[PDB]
Amino acid sequence: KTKLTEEEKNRLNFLKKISQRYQKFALPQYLKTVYQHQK
Could you give the CA distance from residue 34 to residue 39 in angstroms, rounded to a whole number? 8
- From residue 17, how far is each of 21, 26, 27 by CA, in Å? 6, 13, 15
Structural domains counted in the chain: 1
SS3 34: helix
Buried b (16+ CB within 10 A) or exposed e, 6-18: eeeeeeeeeeeee
The H-or-E segment that residue 12 falls in is helix 4-25
**Phi then psi dihedrals of residue 38, to 5 deg:** -55, 120
**Phi then psi dihedrals of residue 21, to 5 deg:** -80, -45
For residue 24, give its domain range: 4-37
